[PDB]
Amino acid sequence: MKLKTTLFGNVYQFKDVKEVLAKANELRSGDVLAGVAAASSQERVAAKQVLSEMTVADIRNNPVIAYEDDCVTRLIQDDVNETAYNQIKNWSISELREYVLSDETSVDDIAFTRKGLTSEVVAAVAKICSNADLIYGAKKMPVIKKANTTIGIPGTFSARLQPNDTRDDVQSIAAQIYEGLSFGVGDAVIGVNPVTDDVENLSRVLDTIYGVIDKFNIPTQGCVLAHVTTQIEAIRRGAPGGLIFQSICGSEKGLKEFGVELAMLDEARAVGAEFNRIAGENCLYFETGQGSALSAGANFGADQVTMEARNYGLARHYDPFIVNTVVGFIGPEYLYNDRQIIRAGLEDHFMGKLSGISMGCDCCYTNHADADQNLNENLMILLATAGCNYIMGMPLGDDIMLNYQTTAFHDTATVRQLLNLRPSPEFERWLESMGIMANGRLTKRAGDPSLFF
Amino acid sequence: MKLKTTLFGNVYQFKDVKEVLAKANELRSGDVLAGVAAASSQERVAAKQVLSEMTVADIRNNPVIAYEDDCVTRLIQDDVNETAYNQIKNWSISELREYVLSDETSVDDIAFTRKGLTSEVVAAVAKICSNADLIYGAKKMPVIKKANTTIGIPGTFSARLQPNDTRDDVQSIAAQIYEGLSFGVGDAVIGVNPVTDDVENLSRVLDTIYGVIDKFNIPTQGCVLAHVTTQIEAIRRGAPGGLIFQSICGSEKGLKEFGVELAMLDEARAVGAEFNRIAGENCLYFETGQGSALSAGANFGADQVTMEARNYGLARHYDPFIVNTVVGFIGPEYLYNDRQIIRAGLEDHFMGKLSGISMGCDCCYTNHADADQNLNENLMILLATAGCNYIMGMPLGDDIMLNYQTTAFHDTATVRQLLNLRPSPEFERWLESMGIMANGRLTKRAGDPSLFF
Amino acid sequence: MKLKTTLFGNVYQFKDVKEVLAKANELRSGDVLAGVAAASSQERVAAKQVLSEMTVADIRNNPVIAYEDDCVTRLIQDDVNETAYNQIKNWSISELREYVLSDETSVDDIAFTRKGLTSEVVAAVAKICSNADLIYGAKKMPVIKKANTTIGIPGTFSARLQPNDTRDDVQSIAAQIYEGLSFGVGDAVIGVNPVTDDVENLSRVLDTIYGVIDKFNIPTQGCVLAHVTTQIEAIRRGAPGGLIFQSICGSEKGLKEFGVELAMLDEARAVGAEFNRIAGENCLYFETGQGSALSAGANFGADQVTMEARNYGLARHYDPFIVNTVVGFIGPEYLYNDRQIIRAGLEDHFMGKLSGISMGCDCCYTNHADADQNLNENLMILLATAGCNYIMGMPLGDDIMLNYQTTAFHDTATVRQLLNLRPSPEFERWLESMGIMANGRLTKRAGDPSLFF
Amino acid sequence: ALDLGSAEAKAWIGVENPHRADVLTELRRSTVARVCTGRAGPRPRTQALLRFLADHSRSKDTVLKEVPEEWVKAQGLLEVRSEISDKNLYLTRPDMGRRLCAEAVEALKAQCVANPDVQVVISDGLSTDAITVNYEEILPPLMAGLKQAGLKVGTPFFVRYGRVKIEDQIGEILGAKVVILLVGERPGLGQSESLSCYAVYSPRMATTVEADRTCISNIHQGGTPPVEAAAVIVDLAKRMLEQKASGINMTR
Ligand code: COY
């Protein structure tokens, strides 16, 4: 493989694949913090060209953390369909980009080709894509999964109802649920991040969620986003099982930071099959986002985009119902502003769909980042055009506990009515029964939580 | 439990669940041979009534072969969703029959309900269903799988091309392939039962099948129906992998008779993931049929319907692309005539769809059985209305090597055009491109294998 | 009037309507340069609240430049439907925002309501709208015009072919024309900004544009974007007239800077009626953009958003076929970065649609501004979802002569295929006849200018 | 006229023509979340959007504000800092926020007690308001809980510009068996006084992972009351000594 190019008479030398992958990234504060970013726009482009000229084989055989040192690398590499790999191993990343974007490449062609990819190759394609490349490429790669609702069907747009409270108060949780359902939010999941990671508390939160689900026969699923171990334990004790959640990272050390072993995720599948109230075949839920590996000291000299793609390689193995990047969840140290957050969200969603997972995005930012709510509204619409499977829904987008701003309930309704998108067909049916939705649009009585009383 | 009822003033006493299950069956040759059949028509009805009043719990807790002695029973029992089971355990088999047939019961309702079932419960429901119950019940339970084609979508009907030869001659296999395709047969699979169970011959037959697939870019998959161990070896040594086949039985003793361990089916799953040319997520293929357990001395005093249902509970664990009963493959000793073959075929298909597998049927009879080709045409049409995922296809239905008669290539075209059913959407598009199909109908130039030359 | 509010216990006092309008704007470079921007984020919100509580009458009666001193103000004020105005004069700007965004407000409701508005009122509503408000609001306000093509029908998306050259070389102009058409660009207009502002050169460029139009019978119109006086002369002396162009400004001083009298636009209207090859009733074409008034010293202490809205009030009087903002044409001094360009673009488009003009947008940036091509791709997609009537098209977006980057020909095809939008119905039919388009999608032979040879 | 920061503005119901209007008041009272604001089409109502923007401007100011040097000195605390110099650097360099500066290491060895059983550490983190409002309510009952009916207590000190991982260095240098860190969480939209507690048993720079810590979050008057939270942290500290474990390694 060639590790150098000439640009405007100047030679641009690179030491390894990991460096080329890093410097080909568009500028972000996290890559500068990791010391892996390009020195200039010229070096960035030269890195993109070197990357584009490298083969799938060059990148598959050079994962950022070695096979023997990382269980996630082993997981990713051993899931490869080697026949699919052999067909594409001599393709340049330039050729792979053009193949993904081609109108002569069908959904079924990509279904087989993606099986010969590794996460590093997925990231490599994303790095040589413009914003519209990432949007259009993702759109022609739909991923459909099924719990009690079907998510990912082109022409549809789902939403996680996120009814969070500072004290896990069941009245405050219910009120946000009723408000969310009134806007048609909740077809992805009704998922609460709990304050106390406690078995008795999880059961009470779940019973509140399922108290509403059972009362109105809602086709959906509940979830409590504690550590996977306490979810498993509570469900084993008889708490209602919908989706089982875990935050994942793209390295073994990153998973050890979260207190996760691969055996726990396998156990989550088995507990779900034995206990969970899910009609379909998918019941797992993961969240991701750029910067997490670097935060854990677990990026090993690799950029955050490549590490983020490794998440999707790991997630794919467990065939989850939904995955979303939580794009601006952490802070300005990994993604500084509007520009970087938008780019990351488009990258994350593109890579998720190329990896073949049910990919959504929590369009978000923090109050210490150079951003505002107009960023969320910009990104959610761009991502919805890319066929993003789901976003979050909170009252006005204000999380009273997690201390950040996501998308409003209003925003899902806006996106759906703007782009003529429907909810999950099962959930849509229920919304019509309740008189909340007619022909994809909120009725006059919608947006009013008192309708349920 | 009640193992007793009074009918017309006469008390009928039954020993156990196994006897109730056996005697509730409609009269068939195999059950008489097994000595488990009813003595009279009144006792048959008595057993039906006793079975109908028994609960799901009664049948689930009493499998025909014990948990500790049978790995198939273990696999069936351990796959149960206990939350689903607990909702329905106090239901009578009569109530479950009415639940399956009800128009208020949706596809998604059965999706969750069936996870609380075992194969014996599946069998029990079938035993108290009339022929139209079996047809209507199966129809409202579609099962959709995807390899390189999608099978089981309502309004579609697929077909296995079975180009068998007496010497595995490649000219004879190819000739039948071109004939079948010209009628629109082969969307399920192009599957050859080989004469010689060895690696080089399997590799030659697969190269012949895939020579056709590659030349005309056919969206389909190949299969050589040898023993699973020989297929695995051929595939590992470089032969093109499509579907991996294994004949299965409803008991550990039965599997030992065929020389199969559950680890081989696990291995096939893993080998498929690494090597097979399959775009979708399903690649296994099983064949089943009533009488095989009784032939093996592996029915353990149980009837052939219940044993056949256990095949589907076993198959379900491995989430195969396709399963079919080979309804009258063996002989009159297990299924005597037209009546019994039709009944068995409807039972098998209904039980497979209830078990959540991609259930098709080889509509067939042997020459020493009391049947003819008109039987095959009666059954194929009835099963097609039940939403049978696929049938076989051979030139006029004559297997020149397995020595039996199945359905003709003509029969698939007939069923499609009679019932306004389409092929697999991917394969249909290929047929339209080849000028073989227009609007679900064969064109003038169709039915002519020389079209490919 | 209230020119005061209290926020967090702090009293914020404003001098006049002009200051309230200016400070309510989202932060941008031009407003700081003008010295009219807010001092803090709290004062920005204070100005937003003060503006929202002001009535339509408050804003209508206080234009930024006086009636007696400004012919643009006079034209805006005299065009008002007083019956419409009287119905809404006591409405707060907050109530008018809610009225525009409401799903109970139909296209015909806004049709009458907007006639009681002035440009300052249009601007005021925009200032208290979030990014998604601007997008959704504009989307439910379609504006349809017709030349030789119809533009602005919901579900359609047009494009200006901009084949500019450094020497007005006819081979270079034609080459870009064939390239643009091969991507389906040119339904809005084929418009050239000329190097030399003289009659013979304009006549030569128009003959080149119309040489292509006549040879392939293209339903479209040509335009040379010189000064209106030179276009008029060329047309009167026999050059083919399509659209007549003029750059406009929001003040009399601003128009004098460009060297335009309102009588010239009246003359263009009359010249168009006598000479132009236009089937429909619309033939004028204006371009606008924030900062131009401030550049001319003609903003009179007012912000660039309000001044840009006055452009649309002026344009409306002349009922043009198309108007577009050239969002980031000037430099960082008026719009600094990605954020500000996106915001301005959404504002401009929303305000144009509210004013009832056929509003499009040149999604663009300059090389001395803090932006890149990914900005153009973000904005073009967002505006397309807002129902933007048209964007520009140039080979890769590189203007080799105006020295800026706009949207690529590729981008129009991308937006259309991403969002299932069609070209102008007349032009779409031409593309289908040429074998360039099928079902809204580019064919295999499309994207190739040699197709015309 | 209305102040967007006032109680009436926060309690505002914007739902037009409600199905059951007494339920909406009961829903607005049951939660601090921005519920019952109604809509204009699928978009938020103007007043709700204004209140959102007003609370954002206040939230932006609340993040770059600093605890005065005089305030910490008045609380009788040692002020020490990380490798970070100012607020701007703190927001972009988390790695420097995780390490004490050279003069900080020396000051801790000089002025703090050696080998304590429980070490209490306070840091501004991402919110100065979190430690300002809650301090007098949380810190005194924490000390009167750990000492009274307890064991060896370290001296409390303030870390300026600190991140959670810095308690690992603090545990090694001081030889602490249990390190308690009271730190300001990133500020929310309409609320910025939310404090967190991070506790770890015998930490090491090269072995301790984040899962080894126990988190007590949302400590404020709107969450877990600082006085009530103080007794929770004491009990946690006692359980951590008894089990010789923290975080995921603990029982129940
Ligand atoms: C930001 C944040 C994070 C992030 C860490 C910060 C970073 N990487 O720089 C993030 C995204 C990695 C994250 C992950 C998790 C994981 C794992 C944490 C671990 N063991 O490493 C987590 C276990 C989720 C899961 N189920 O797997 C988790 C949880 C449950 C919690 C909760 C703790 C419950 C409890 N009582 O134990 C929690 C209170 C929220 C809640 N659910 O109510 C919160 C502390 C919840 C917090 C809510 C709140 N109200 O405070 C919140 C919002 C802010 C904390 C803060 O402001 N700290 C102050 C700041 C100055 O400290 P700092 O030094 O800069 O940062 C440190 C701490 O934040 C610490 N830390 C953060 N979380 C956390 C949890 C525990 C138990 C411990 C001991 C220490 C923890 O890690 C860093 C070390 O540098 C937060 N987190 Co986390 C909330 C989870 C978010 C949803 C999924 N998610 C979002 N984005 C991404 C992503 N990119 N990838 C994957 N997943 C996600 N968090 N979290 N988190």
Swiss-Prot record, chains A, B, C:
| Annotated GO biological process | amino acid metabolic process; ethanolamine catabolic process
Instruction: Give the induction text.
Output: When grown in ethanolamine and adenosylcobalamin (AdoCbl) (at protein level). Note this experiment was done in strain JM109, which expresses the eut operon.
One GO term in the molecular function aspect is: cobalamin binding
What family is it from? Belongs to the EutB family.
The cofactor binding remark recorded in the entry reads: Binds 1 AdoCbl between the large and small subunits, with 6 cofactors per holoenzyme.
| Gene that encodes it | eutB
Q: How does it assemble?
A: The basic unit is a heterodimer which dimerizes to form tetramers. The heterotetramers trimerize; 6 large subunits form a core ring with 6 small subunits projecting outwards.
Q: What is this protein called?
A: Ethanolamine ammonia-lyase large subunit
**Which key words tag this protein in UniProt?**
Bacterial microcompartment, Cobalamin, Cobalt, Lyase
Subcellular location per UniProt equals: Bacterial microcompartment
Q: Which GO terms describe its cellular component?
A: cytosol; ethanolamine ammonia-lyase complex; ethanolamine degradation polyhedral organelle
What is the recorded function of this protein according to its Swiss-Prot or TrEMBL entry? Answer: Catalyzes the deamination of various vicinal amino-alcohols to oxo compounds. Allows this organism to utilize ethanolamine as the sole source of nitrogen and carbon in the presence of external vitamin B12. It is spontaneously inactivated by its substrate and reactivated by EutA.
Question: Where is the major localization of this protein?
Answer: other
- Reactions catalysed according to its record: ethanolamine = acetaldehyde + NH4(+)
Biological pathway:
Amine and polyamine degradation; ethanolamine degradation
Cross-referenced Pfam families: EutB
Swiss-Prot record, chain D:
Q: What's the record's remark on domains?
A: Partial trypsin digestion of this subunit (removing the first 28 residues) yields an active protein less susceptible to aggregation.
Q: How is the cofactor bound?
A: Binds 1 AdoCbl between the large and small subunits, with 6 cofactors per holoenzyme.
Cofactor(s) of this protein: adenosylcob(III)alamin
Keyword Kinase attributed: no
Catalytic EC class: lyase
The top of its lineage is: Bacteria, Pseudomonadati, Pseudomonadota, Gammaproteobacteria, Enterobacterales
An annotated Gene Ontology molecular function: cobalamin binding
Give the similarity note: Belongs to the EutC family.
Q: Which organism is it from?
A: Escherichia coli (strain K12)
Quaternary state and interactors: The basic unit is a heterodimer, which further associates into a trimer of heterotetramers. 6 large subunits form a core ring with 6 small subunits projecting outwards.
Q: Which InterPro entries match?
A: EutC, EutC_C
Catalytic activity, as annotated: ethanolamine = acetaldehyde + NH4(+)
Pfam families recorded: EutC (PF05985)
Compartments, as annotated in UniProt:
Bacterial microcompartment
The primary site where this protein sits is other
Task: Give the record's pathway.
Answer: Amine and polyamine degradation; ethanolamine degradation
Anything known on activity regulation?
A: Inhibited by 5-adeninylpentylcobalamin (AdePeCbl), a cofactor analog. Irreversibly inhibited during catalysis by cleavage of the Co-C bond of the cobalamin coenzyme. Reactivated by EutA, which probably involves an ATP-dependent cobalamin exchange.
Q: Where does adenosylcob(III)alamin bind?
A: V164, E185, C215
State the protein's purpose: Catalyzes the deamination of various vicinal amino-alcohols to oxo compounds. Ethanolamine ammonia-lyase (EAL) allows bacteria to utilize ethanolamine as the sole source of nitrogen and carbon in the presence of external vitamin B12. It is spontaneously inactivated by its substrate and reactivated by EutA. Directly targeted to the BMC. May play a role in bacterial microcompartment (BMC) assembly or maintenance.
The UniProt keyword set, sorted, is: Bacterial microcompartment, Cobalamin, Cobalt, Lyase
Q: Which GO terms describe its biological process?
A: amino acid metabolic process; ethanolamine catabolic process
Q: Does the keyword Lyase apply?
A: yes
- Give the EC number(s) listed in the UniProt record: 4.3.1.7
* GO CC annotations, alphabetized: ethanolamine ammonia-lyase complex; ethanolamine degradation polyhedral organelle
Induction / repression: When grown in ethanolamine and adenosylcobalamin (AdoCbl) (at protein level). Note this experiment was done in strain JM109, which expresses the eut operon.
Q: What protein am I looking at?
A: Ethanolamine ammonia-lyase small subunit
